[PDB]
Amino acid sequence: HWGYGKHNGPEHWHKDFPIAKGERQSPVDIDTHTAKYDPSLKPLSVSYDQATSLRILNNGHSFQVEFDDSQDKAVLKGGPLDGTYRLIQFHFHWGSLDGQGSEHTVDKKKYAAELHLVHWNTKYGDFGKAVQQPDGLAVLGIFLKVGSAKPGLQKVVDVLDSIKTKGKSADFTNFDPRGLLPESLDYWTYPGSLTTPPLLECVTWIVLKEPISVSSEQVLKFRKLNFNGEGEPEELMVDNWRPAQPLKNRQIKASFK
Ligand SMILES: CCOc1ccc2nc(S(N)(=O)=O)sc2c1
Ligand SMILES: [Zn+2]
Numbered sequence: 224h225w226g227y228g229k230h231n232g233p234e235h236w237h238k239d240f241p242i243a244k245g246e247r248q249s250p251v252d253i254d255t256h257t258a259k260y261d262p263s264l265k266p267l268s269v270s271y272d273q274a275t276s277l278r279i280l281n282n283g284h285s286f287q288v289e290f291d292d293s294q295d296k297a298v299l300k301g302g303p304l305d306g307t308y309r310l311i312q313f314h315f316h317w318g319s320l321d322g323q324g325s326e327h328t329v330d331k332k333k334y335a336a337e338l339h340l341v342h343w344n345t346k347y348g349d350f351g352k353a354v355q356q357p358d359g360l361a362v363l364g365i366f367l368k369v370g371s372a373k374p375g376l377q378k379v380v381d382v383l384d385s386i387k388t389k390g391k392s393a394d395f396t397n398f399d400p401r402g403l404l405p406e407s408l409d410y411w412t413y414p415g416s417l418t419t420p421p422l423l424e425c426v427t428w429i430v431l432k433e434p435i436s437v438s439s440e441q442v443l444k445f446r447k448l449n450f451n452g453e454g455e456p457e458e459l460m461v462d463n464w465r466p467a468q469p470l471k472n473r474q475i476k477a478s479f480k
Contacts, residue, residue, distance in 0.1 A: 225239065225240075225419075225420050226284065226450065227284065227450075227462055227463050227464075228458075233465045233466055236420060236422065239420070240420050240421055240422050242416075242421070242422050242423070242424065243422050245416065245422070245424055246424075246471050246472065247414050247415055247416055247424045247471070247473065248415065248416045248422065248424070248468035248469070249326070249327075249415030249416045249417070249418050249426065249428060249465075249468060250326035250327045250328075250415070250418055250465060250466075250467055250468065251327065251413065251415065251467050251468055251469075251470050251473075251475075252327070252328045252329075252330075252331060252467045252470075253327060253328065253329050253330070253411050253430065253475055254330060254475070255329060255330050255477075256330075257475070258411055258475040258476065258477040259474055259475070259476050259477065260476075260477050260478075260479070260480045261476040261477070261478070264302060264303055264412070264476060264478040265301045265302055265303075266301055266302070266408060266478070267299065267300075267301050267302040267408045267410065267429065268299070268300040268301035268302075269299055269363075269401075269404065269408070270297065270298045270299070270300070271297045271310070271399070271400050271401050272401075273296040273297065274290055274296055274297035274310065274398075274399065274400055275290060275291040275296055275297075275396075276288055276289070276290055276395050276396055276397065276398035276400075277289050277290060277291055277394075277395065277396065278392050278393065278394060278395050279379070279382055279386055279392065279393050279395040280386065280391070280392040281386040281387065281388060281389055281390065281391050281392070281448060281449075281460075282314075282389070282390075283389035283390070283450060283452075284419060284450065284460075284463055285314040285315060285316065285460075285463055286314060286315070286383065286386060286448060287312045287313065287314040288312060288313050288314070288379065288395060288398060288400075289311065289312045289395075290310050290311060290312060292309045292310065292311045292343070292350070295307060295309060295345070296309075296310075297309065297310040297400070298310065298342070299340075299342045299361055299363065299429075302410065302412065302429055302478070303412045303427060303429070303476070304361055304427060305358070306344055306345065306346055307344070307345050308342035308343060308344050308345070308360075308361045309342055309343055309345055310340060310341070310342050310400070311341055311342065311343055311350055312341050313338060313339060313340045313341065313400060313403075314338075314339055314341075315336055315337065315338050315339070315367075315445065316336060316337045316339070316418075316463055316464040317335065317336035317337075317367075317442060317445050317446070317461065317462075317463065317464070318333075318335060318336070318461060318462050318464065319446065319459075319461035319462050321335045321369045321439070321442070322335075323335070323462070323464070324336040324337065324367075324442075324462070324464060325337040325366055325367075325464065326364075326418050326464045326465055326467075327364055327366070327428075327430050327467075328467055329366075334366040334367055334368055334434060335367050335368060335369050335437075335442055336366075336367035336437070336442060336445070337364055337365065337366055337367065337464070338364070338365040338366075338367065338403060338435075339362050339363070339364055339418075340362065340363040340365075340400065340403075341360060341362050342360065342361045342362070342363070343359060343360055343361075344356070344358060344359050344360070344361070347359055353425065354417070354421075354423050354425045355423070355425065356425055357414075357424065357425060358425075358427065359425040359426075360417075360425050360426045360427070361426070361427045361428075361429060362426050362427075362428055362429065363429050363431065364428060364429065364430040364431065365403065365404070365405065365430075365431050365434070365435060366430075366431070366434035366435070367434060367435055367436070367437050367442070368434040368435075368436055368437075369436070369437065369438065369439050369442060370436035370437075370438070371436045371437075371438060372436075372437060372438035372440070372441060373402075373403070373435055373436060373437045373438075373441065374402065375399070375401075375402020375403055376402070376403060376437055376441055377441070378398060379398070380441050380444045380445075382395060383444050383445070383447070383448060384447075386448075387447070387448060387449055388449045388451060388452050388453040388455075389449065389450065389451060389452040390452055390453075391453070403435065404435075405431055405433035405434065405435050406433065407431075407432065407433045408431065409431070409432045409433065409477075409478055409479040410429050410430060410431050410432060410477070410478050410479075411428075411429075411430045411432065411475050411476065411477050411478075412427065412428060412429050412430070412475070412476050412478070413428055413470075413473050413474070413475045413476070414426070414427060414428070414473060415427075415428045415473075418464075418465045419465070432477075432479065445460075446459060446460070446461050447459070448460035450463075
């Protein structure tokens with residue numbers, strides 16, 4: 224099975240998922256001086272006022288908060304997108320130390336963690352159909368830096384003990400993902416891929432310029448999760464991030480000057 228360990232980590236993924244060496248892989252380093260400002264880009268439109276969270280799950284390589292996506296409750300529109308994208312889940316990537324953890328980097332700077340809000344294009348009817356299409360997903364990426372606490376993240380931090388090992392889930396209702404957004408919605412965008420297997424090249428990435436702050440205590444609680452299932456040898460869930468991949472024939476666009 225693939226993972227983030229020495230014997231099954233990202234450098235090995237291509238043997239089972241040859242698209243790992245593809246032309247539009249993620250994540251990438253965002254070179255701020257080379258990104259192109261595009262005044263054609265629209266502001267993002269984040270519509271999360273009716274979101275309905277359902278569950279939180281330790282999937283063995285991250286934890287994810289899942290949402291009801293059977294109706295246009297929580298949607299993303301605008302920016303570089305065409306059409307309406309529904310929120311299905313968010314999850315994080317983080318490090319063993321505060322100096323690493325994010326997937327995207329900015330001028331080679333790593334952040335302590337990265338939040339992915341994953342949305343699928345409703346014109347494809349369901350998420351499994353959307354990931355086979357080059358415009359099927361839109362992922363909102365938010366960097367986390369260590370500093371002050373993020374009050375809106377604490378309900379998540381508080382339930383992690385319940386889902387410590389792989390395959391455990393818990394009811395997680397009435398969570399409002401608006402409390403995870405930064406103040407500004409300025410962004411970079413490029414065409415890319417899922418950053419875990421199957422690494423499909425179906426994602427429009429929208430990476431926010433402004434990080435959110437979280438406290439050292441909040442991130443430390445992430446690092447107490449386990450990659451293993453209950454009853455198995457304890458392996459702490461840390462450094463579940465992929466390297467920056469080559470940009471190849473892609474242009475990163477910025478919504479801001
Ligand atoms: C297709 C089975 O579900 C998947 C698989 C990988 C995957 N990676 C991301 S990420 N890290 O946001 O690029 S969301 C996601 C959903
Ligand atoms: Zn992710």
